[PDB]
From a paper:
We previously demonstrated that [name], a [name] hydroxymethylase in the mildiomycin biosynthetic gene cluster in [name] ZJU5119, can convert [name] to hmCMP12. [name] and CH are akin to the superfamily of thymidylate synthases (TS), which transfers a methyl group from CH2THF to dUMP to form dTMP in the de novo thymidylate synthesis pathway and, hence, DNA synthesis. In this study, we demonstrated that [name] has a substrate preference for [name] (kcat/KM = 39.2 mM−1 min−1) over dCMP (kcat/KM = 7.84 mM−1 min−1), and thus offers an opportunity to investigate the mechanism by which conserved TS evolves the preference for ribosyl over 2′-deoxyribosyl groups. In the structures of apo [name] and its complexes with various substrates, [name] are all homodimers.
The crystal structures of apo [name], [name] in complexes with [name], dCMP and hmCMP were determined. The structure of C-terminally His-tagged [name] was determined using selenomethionine (SeMet)-substituted [name]-L167M mutant at a 2.20 Å resolution. The electron density for residues 305–308 was poor in the structure of apo [name] but resolved clearly in the structures of all the [name]‒substrate complexes. There is no obvious difference between the structures of [name]-bound [name] and apo [name], with the root-mean-square deviation (RMSD) being 0.34 Å for 634 aligned Cα atoms. The N-terminal three residues, C-terminal five residues, residue 232–238 of [name], as well as the eight residues (LEHHHHHH) introduced by cloning, showed no clear electron density and presumably were disordered in the crystal. A [name] monomer consists of a six-stranded β-sheet, surrounded by thirteen α-helices and four 310-helices. Compared with TS and CH, [name] has an extra domain consisting of five α helices (from α9 to α13) in its C-terminal region. C-terminal truncations either from residue 235 or from residue 249 of [name] are both insoluble (data not shown). Presumably, this region could function as a domain to facilitate protein folding.
Numbering used by the authors:
A (entry chain A): 4 to 231, 239 to 305, 307 to 329
B (entry chain B): 3 to 231, 239 to 304, 309 to 329
Write the structure that this text describes.
Amino acid sequence: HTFGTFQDAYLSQLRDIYHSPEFRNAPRGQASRERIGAGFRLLDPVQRHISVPARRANVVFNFAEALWYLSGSDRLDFIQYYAPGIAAYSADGRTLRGTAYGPRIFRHPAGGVNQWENVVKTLTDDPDSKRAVIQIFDPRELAVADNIDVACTLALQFLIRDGLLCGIGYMRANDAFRGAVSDVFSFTFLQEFTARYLGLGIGTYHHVVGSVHIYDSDARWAERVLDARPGFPAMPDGDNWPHVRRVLEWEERLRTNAARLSADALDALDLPAYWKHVVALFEAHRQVRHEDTPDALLAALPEVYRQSLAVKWPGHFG
Amino acid sequence: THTFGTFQDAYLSQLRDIYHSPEFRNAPRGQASRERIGAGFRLLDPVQRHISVPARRANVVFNFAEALWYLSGSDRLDFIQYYAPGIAAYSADGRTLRGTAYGPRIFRHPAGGVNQWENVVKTLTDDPDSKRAVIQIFDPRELAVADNIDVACTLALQFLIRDGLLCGIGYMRANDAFRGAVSDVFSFTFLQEFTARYLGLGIGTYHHVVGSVHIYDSDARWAERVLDARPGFPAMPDGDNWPHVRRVLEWEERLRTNAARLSADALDALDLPAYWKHVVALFEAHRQVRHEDTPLAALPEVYRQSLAVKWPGHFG
C-alpha cells in the first residue's frame, strides 16, 4: 500500500472500495460502500493534488482550508465562501466545531493547548521523539446528543527520520471520494509547513482510517473519475509564518471584495513567489465569486494551478 | 497491514519484520531501538489473544490484572505494580500513573470527566452503523507537562458493529513490538470482547494500527530467543459482565494485600461464572508466589502453561 503521489493512492483506494466494498450500510441514514481500517503511504507528499479533470479538484478551496487551519479560526464566514455547503455543519450559523481543526491544533478545547508549538519544541529537544502528536478529536464531542459536527480526524503525528519530517494522519472515518482530497492536502500541507519551519526535508506521509467510504449518492461521479503531469510547487524553506500572515490579510480583503489585485499588483507583492501564486488564486476566486472580469494572472501561475482553475471554472479560465 | 487468525501469528510475524528488516535505528529519549513506521495487523480471531511461546514467558496474570485495572477506572500504582514491579518507573509521585492508566481515560477522561465507554454503548445502541464510537485515550495536555515520564502511547480505540459483530480498532502513536504489544493487544481485545458480550454481539475483527513500532536494543537478545523458538483461550460469558467484574475486583484486592486466601475448594464455591472463577484462581496463584505461601487443576490449559512457564518452581 505504498504510492508515489496522493493521486495514485486516491484512485487505487477509490477502485478498491467501489468494486470490492467490505460492507454496504447507512450510518446516520446515508447509504455507503465501506472498507474498515484502510490506509496508504505516500513517498512524495508535496505532490498532494488530484489533476484528473473528471474530479474537478478545487485548489483554491484546498489552500483556503489549510490556511484557515493555520489561522486557528473556527469562523464559518471564512470557509463557507470557498465551500458554501459547509454551512450545513454549523449549528449557530457563524462557527464550526469538529470541522474547525484550527482551534484543535493551536488552542485545543482540552486545556487551550497550542499543540503545534509543543510539537516543534518536542522535536527540537529530542529529534527522534515518538511523542510529537497533535490531538484533534475530543471526548466531549460524542457526549452531546444530536452533534452535527463531530471531528473525523483523531490525531496527526510527526517524526524526524534521517533528516526528513514524516507525517501520519489517523482518522475514525473518511469520505474516500470527497473529504480525503481536502484532508490529505491539508495534512501534507501542514507536514510540509512544519518541515520548512524545522529546516528539514519531507519524508513519507501515512494516512490511516477506521471507516473509509463512498456514498452511493457519489457513485456516478466516482465511476466517471475511475473511467478517466505538472508538479505541485515546493513551499519555501524556513519560517513561513510571516508570509502566511500577509497571505491571510490579502485573503480577507479579496474575499470581502475590499480590494482587487491586477497581474502587476500581484507581482509587486512583498511575498516569496510561492505565496504570490496563492494570493493570485484568491484573486482569481474573487473574480468568480464577485463576478468581475476574468483576467494575464492565469499565465503567471504554475501549470497545476492553471489546470485546476481551467477545469473548475471553464467559463472563466478555460 | 496483513491479516492473521490469532494474535500469536501476528505477533511473531511483526516481531520478525522489525527485528530482521528494521526500517530505522534511532534512540528516542536516549533509548536505542530498531523501528518501522506505520505498521499494523488485523486479527480474525481476537479472543485468541495470548502468546504461548514458552521463551516469551507471557504472564497471563498480569494480562488480566491490567485489563481489570482499566475496567476499575483506577490510576493507582499499588494495584498494578504488584503484577509488574517495573511499572513503578513511570510513576512521578509513587502513588499514581498518568498515561499508563487507561482506566480513567476510558471512564472519566480528563477532557471533561467523560465516561466514554458509556457514550460508546449508547452511540452503538442508537445507531449500530455509527462511525463515531470512539474512546479517546491521548490528551493534549500531556506534552505540556514538563519532563513527563508517562505519556499515553494509545491515541484512541474505535468500535464498529458490522454484520452483527463488534469490530475494534486500536490506534497508537507508538508500540513496543516485543513487550507492550503483548499486553496492549490483550487488553484491547479483552475490552472489545467485554463490550461485545454487553451488547449481545459476536466478536468481529480487531485492527492494530501504530505509528512507531519498535524493539529496544536492550530486548534484542530475548526477542531473538523468542523468534528462534494449541490450547484455546476461553470465551468470556454472554451478557453484562460488570457484576462479575465488580466481584472479581473485590477478590483481587483481598488477595493482593494478603487479606485473604482461597483454597481450591474455596475457589469452586465462589458465586461466579466459571470463566471468572479461573481469573480469581490466577490471582490466588499469584498471591502464593508474591506472599511466599505454599503452592490449578481446574484451570484452562492456556493458564496452566502460562503459570508453569512463568513460575516453574511453583507450578512447573
